[PDB]
Amino acid sequence: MIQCYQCEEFQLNNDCSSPEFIVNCTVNVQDMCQKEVMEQSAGIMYRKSCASSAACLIASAGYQSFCSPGKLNSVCISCCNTPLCN
Numbered sequence: 001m002i003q004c005y006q007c008e009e010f011q012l013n014n015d016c017s018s019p020e021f022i023v024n025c026t027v028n029v030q031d032m033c034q035k036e037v038m039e040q041s042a043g044i045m046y047r048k049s050c051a052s053s054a055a056c057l058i059a060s061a062g063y064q065s066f067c068s069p070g071k072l073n074s075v076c077i078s079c080c081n082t083p084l085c086n
Helices: 053-061
Strands: 030-039 044-052 076-080
Touching: 030 053, 044 053, 053 076
Parallel strands: none
Antiparallel strands: 030 044, 030 076
């Protein structure tokens, strides 16, 4: 019913867009998707994986959620309740 894309390997390519990484996180525990953005010498990395309700609140409630595109420590956190958010 509701699935999400999980990507533990942060790479600077478009390979992280396959339907094989899409998992059906229907379990009460996790029912949302997690997305993160990072920037370093290597390039622009991004973390993704199945998130949960309680966790989703953490990021939101957690101040300093916003970020900037032109910042070395450009840390961004956010989740989604819709399927295939990433």
